[PDB]
Amino acid sequence: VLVQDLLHPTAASEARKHKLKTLVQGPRSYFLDVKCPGCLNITTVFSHAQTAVTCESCSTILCTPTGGKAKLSEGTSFRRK
Amino acid sequence: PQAKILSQAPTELELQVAQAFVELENSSPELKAELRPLQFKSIREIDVAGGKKALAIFVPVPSLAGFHKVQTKLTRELEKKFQDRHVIFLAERRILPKPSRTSRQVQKRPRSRTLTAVHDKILEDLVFPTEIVGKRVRYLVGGNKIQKVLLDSKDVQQIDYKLESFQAVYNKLTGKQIVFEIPS
Amino acid sequence: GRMHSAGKGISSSAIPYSRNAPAWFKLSSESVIEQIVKYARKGLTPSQIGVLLRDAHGVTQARVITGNKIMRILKSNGLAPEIPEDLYYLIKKAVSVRKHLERNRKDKDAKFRLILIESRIHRLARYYRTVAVLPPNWKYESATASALVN
Amino acid sequence: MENDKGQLVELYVPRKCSATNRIIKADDHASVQINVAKVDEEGRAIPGEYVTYALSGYVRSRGESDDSLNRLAQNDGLLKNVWSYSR
Amino acid sequence: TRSSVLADALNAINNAEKTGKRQVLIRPSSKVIIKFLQVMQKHGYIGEFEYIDDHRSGKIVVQLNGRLNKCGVISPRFNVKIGDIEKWTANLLPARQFGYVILTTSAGIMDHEEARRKHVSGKILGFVY
Amino acid sequence: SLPATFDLTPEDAQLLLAANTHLGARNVQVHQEPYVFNARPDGVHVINVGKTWEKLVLAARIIAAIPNPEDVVAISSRTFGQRAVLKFAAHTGATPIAGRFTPGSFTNYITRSFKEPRLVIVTDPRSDAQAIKEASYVNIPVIALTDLDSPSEFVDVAIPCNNRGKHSIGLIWYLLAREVLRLRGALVDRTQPWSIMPDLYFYRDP
RNA sequence: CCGGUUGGCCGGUCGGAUUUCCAACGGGGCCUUUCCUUCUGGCUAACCUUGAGCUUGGCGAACCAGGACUUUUACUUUGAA
Ligand SMILES: [Mg+2]
Ligand SMILES: [Mg+2]
Ligand SMILES: [Mg+2]
């Protein structure tokens, strides 16, 4: 193609790219607030965590680290903050 | 009440917005003794094309945070008592000029005292409830520039009606020309 | 890049456009600053402090919540290390390779990799000496280096 | 090109490609000149009343003649929704 | 590694104008790139360009018309006196009636003919025709 | 611009989606094709038939601009389009070339099959590549009944269509013939349909 | 705002040039947050002044002189020798 708008790519085509190869680079990660079984104790956890994040009230470990996104434990209720 | 918030010799206009502050303060004690420290230097009136002038209220840079804590409430009450105006709180920041080759040395001129930094700070504090998410600068073929700033769609109902006035106050303060855009 | 290898990978953090962040964050500067110096008092480097603030707490990155950086906060509060963190980690990597080489002499690959590790050590030491965070006459030599690790 | 007092010299001012603004040479045997007929109020084409498009051999060999002709036709109003700027 | 961001910009513009494209993205957008593009734009060799502000260095999207044959850089920036301008223009311009040698003099970045009008010289940056 | 009777009627749309002209290629897609509209969970893509209608009426405008109708040339070496280009050549002044394009028909001015067309229309650019390749030697515009995976080099107007199907190829040639006769004025009724059935342009087995 | 060159202008003598003038190019002064340092005197430069429109009494380069504080280069222009 020889004529195209480089300043206004479509939303789909920007979502297809790598995070550094977009127009302005930005993270595709996010934060979550996770609530642990029992005590309410909302806590914010990074999406690609690298640490075994636990709530301050009890050892009720909320996520396990993996190569990419953290695996949230099974009885947990998250909202994408 | 009036003259303590003001700095040096006040003008009738400043006095009037000071009276607006003190008649705000006596009511609603959830802002009383929170906006007791708040105080501005001066006020500039500049005419927009629509007939309705604008109010730039120059606050000190430490004060600015304190204004921002209550800023929607003040601009609402002040615009609701000063008709034919929009209202903004800008921070008076000092530019030190760029040292020439021969000019004798002074201290290092930190980056906050440069013209580019204070100009995008006044661009930042024109639009306070919203956030600038993008910035474009068009270079037209005649030789003149147009800066475009991109605002996020949260709380744009607060400043969607003030945008051409925002343009006029930035043209008066800097000589530049800006356009606003909300990507949607 | 990857100056001591043939790798050409592009993997890094892409920090956001907002220098003032993140508008779900209600905490104050002094609370995360006391959290930072509490973590530093129990002996943690700025990298680990930032990782802990990012995951457990919601702290996107400490330069935008507070005004300054984690190492500046530690240096101003008086818990700065005697040598910088990346230099320390390279020296302890070198001391592990030397202890292995004393044990296993016939590891020519370990000898090669040790030469690379000490080249990286000399490049950082030259830079840190040129900005005077290490005193001039600071030299990395192996018998000193086994003890500078503690 | 002209001399010191008018008198245009450089005979054969040439054609230029409608897509790339490139000179169509005298031996560019891949270049074409599209004539699209004009219509007036009845559904019928008028003989000799054209909108004309020159396309150079370069864009034709690269395969991008069809998109260039789409954009040129849509800009002149003779297409409605074929070409998109945001690609 | 990247030594000359201006050279990379001009090489990208040249590849775009060879391929027939009407636009090109330049990364990383220095000041000298802006002034070089402004010189090309005043003579009518590019058109409108826009500066995208990411916070790292900037990018630029230039719009290309069909008028550019070759924009180049001269590396290193040789020191050029006033007779040297006429030997440089004779070496690297296609004719004596069009094309510009761009050179950074102490009164700003300009082309060689405006430098002759101001009677000023400097270092050579590139060329455009 | 156009008087808005040239919009895609529901009758013509019924013909198009009956013939499966919308059923484009497989996930092979030449990158020069923005004509595709979505995709099917099958892996087969769908063509935007509105764009097919617009490209077809543009090609009809191009055909009608030719002064002498014998100077239009229609090519199909595929059996599914031979009857179509013969019927198009019947209903319009165009000369057909059905079956073998002998090389050197556009070059080689002493050849017995020597044509000098002002426009050539092919059925498949891949199979009829000899005609488009010679047309690039003598400054001749090319209109091709393209698919989403066809080799669109030296094609100037590409009408997107399912050129794997028998009914689709014939319907595209039928609609093209009908539109050039409507613009020429042989069919004065722009709104009323044609007495010729689209089944006349179809391939038959023996 | 202001003058500087090339034009341009009644082709004023039948290829000479009085500028109310269009235009291009090249400088300077001032304001816009713009320190691009000034300790001592004569002289006051602009100058407060000013005679009814040439008057007696404001800012030192405006003219110099005296000392005092000076980030360091490369490059280029002009000139001396
Ligand atoms: Mg000096
Ligand atoms: Mg290396
Ligand atoms: Mg790399």
Cβ-based neighbours of C126, under 8 Å, separated by 6 or more: none
Characterize C101-120 residue by residue with b for buried, 16 or more Cβ atoms within 10 angstroms of its Cβ, and e for exposed: eeeeeeeeebeebbeebbeb
How far are the Cα atoms of A26, C121, F57, F89 from residue F181, in angstroms, in the given order?
Answer: 57, 83, 12, 12
Contact E13, E62 (CB under 8 A): yes
- Decide if E67 and D21 are in contact by the 8 Å CB cutoff: yes
* Determination technique used: cryo-EM
**In chain E, at which residue ranges do the beta strands (DSSP E only) sit?**
23-26, 49-52, 59-63, 71-73, 79-80, 100-105, 108-111, 122-128
Q: Which domain holds residue D30?
A: 1-87
Q: Which ligand is nearest to the CA of C1?
A: 3
- Ligand minimally distant from the alpha carbon of residue C4: 2
Please check whether residues C125 and C67 belong to one and the same domain: no
Residue of F77, F72, F78 lying closest to F59 (CA atoms): F72
Distance C11 CA to ligand 3 centre (A): 10
Query: Which residue places its CA closest to the C1' of nucleotide G76?
Result: E122
The span from the CA of A63 to the CA of A69, in Å, is 10
Element (H, E) at E87: helix E82-92
Q: Does E20 touch chain D (CB under 8 A)?
A: yes
Peptide bond into E28 cis (omega under 30): yes
CA-based R_g, chain A, Å: 18
Q: Are residues C110 and C128 in the same domain?
A: yes
Question: Protein E85 CA to nucleic acid G11 C1', in Å?
Answer: 40
- Do C92 and C140 lie in a common domain? yes
Cα separation, F166 vs F79, whole angstroms: 9
Integer distance in angstroms from CA B100 to C1' G35? 11
Do C76 and C124 share a domain, yes or no?
no
C43, C105: one domain: no
CA of B176 to C1' of G24 (A): 28
If we measure between CA atoms, which residue out of F54, F47, F62 comes closest to residue F8?
A: F54
Residues C143 and C107 in one domain: yes
Which residues does A64 contact at the CB level (< 8 Å), separation at least 6?
A52, A70, A71, A73
CA distances from residue F24 to F43, F149, F199 in whole angstroms, order as listed = 10, 9, 21
Question: Percentages helix, strand, coil for chain C, rounded to the nearest 5?
Answer: 55, 0, 45
Q: How many CB atoms lie within 10 A of CB B4?
A: 10
Distance (Å) from the alpha carbon of D76 to chain F's nearest alpha carbon = 8
3-state secondary structure of B148: strand
Distance CA C36, CA C77 (A): 10
- Same domain for E63 and E112: no
Provide the greatest CA pair distance for chain A.
60
Element of type H or E holding C127: helix C108-130
Q: What is the resolution of this structure in A?
A: 3.0
Domains: count for chain C: 2
> CA-to-CA distance for F122 and F102, rounded, in angstroms?
15
Domain count, chain D: 1
Instruction: State whether the Cα torsion E69-E73-E74-E78 is positive or negative.
Output: positive
List residues bridging with E100 in a β-sheet.
E128
In which domain, by residue range, is C54 found?
A: 26-80
Does B131 lie at the interface with C, CB-CB under 8 angstroms? yes
Catalogue the E-assigned strands of B15-76.
42-47, 53-59
3-class state of residue C107 by DSSP: coil
Give chain E's domain count.
2
Token pair for F104: 């050197």
Angle, helices F79-91 vs F166-184, to 10°: value is 10
User: Do the Cβ atoms of D49 and F139 come closer than 8 Å?
Assistant: no
| E2 lies in the same domain as E24 | yes
One domain, residues C39 and C50 = yes
Give the strand pairing for B53-59 and B85-91. Answer: parallel
Q: Are F44 and F32 in contact (CB under 8 A)?
A: no
> Tokens at residue F54, please?
């617009």
Are both C60 and C73 inside the same structural domain?
Answer: yes
**Nearest chain A CA: its distance from E105 CA (Å):** 33
Residue E25: its chain D contacts at CB < 8 A? none
Both E73 and E129 in one domain: the answer is yes
Cα of B60 vs its chain's centroid, Å? 11
* Residue in B19, B23, B65 with CA at minimum distance from that of residue B43: B19
Q: Work out the number of other CB atoms within 10 angstroms of the CB of residue B58.
A: 16
- Residue C11: inside a domain: no
Q: Are residues C97 and C144 in the same domain?
A: yes
Among candidates E19, E21, E52 on the partner chain, residue whose Cβ is nearest the Cβ of A23? E52
Euclidean distance between CA atoms C148 and B66, whole angstroms: 49
**Location of structure tokens 């599209």:** D34
Chain G nucleotides covered by protein, CB below 7 Å: 25-27, 32-37, 69-72, 75-78
Give the closest of A3, A8, A10 to D71, CB-based.
A3
Instruction: Spell out the residues 6+ positions from residue C92 whose beta carbon is closer than 8 angstroms to its own.
Output: C149
Largest CA distance in chain D: 52
Give the closest-approach CA distance of B128 to chain C in angstroms. 12
C21 in any annotated domain:
no
Contact, F122 vs F152, CB < 8 A?
Answer: no
- Point out the residue among E34, E42, E53 whose CB comes nearest to the CB of B143: E42
DSSP B113: G
- Same domain, yes or no: E79 and E55: no
- Residues, chain F, total? 206
Q: Which residues of A7-17 are buried (b: 16+ CB within 10 A; e: fewer)?
A: eebeeeeeeee
Q: Look up the domain containing E76 and give its range.
A: 69-129
- The residue type of A29 is S
> Within 10 A of D19 (CB to CB), how many other CB atoms are there?
25
Choose from A1, A4, A7, A25 for mutation: most chain E CBs within 10 A: A7
E32 and E61 housed in the same domain = yes
Q: B79 CA to G57 C1', in Å?
A: 57
**Is residue C135 in a domain?**
yes
Q: How do beta strands F36-39 and F45-47 pair?
A: antiparallel
Q: Which residues of chain A lie closer than 8 angstroms to C52, CB-CB?
A: 51
Footprint of strand G on the protein (CB under 7 A): B 92-97, 99-106, 118, 122, 173, 175; E 79-82, 105-107, 114, 117-123
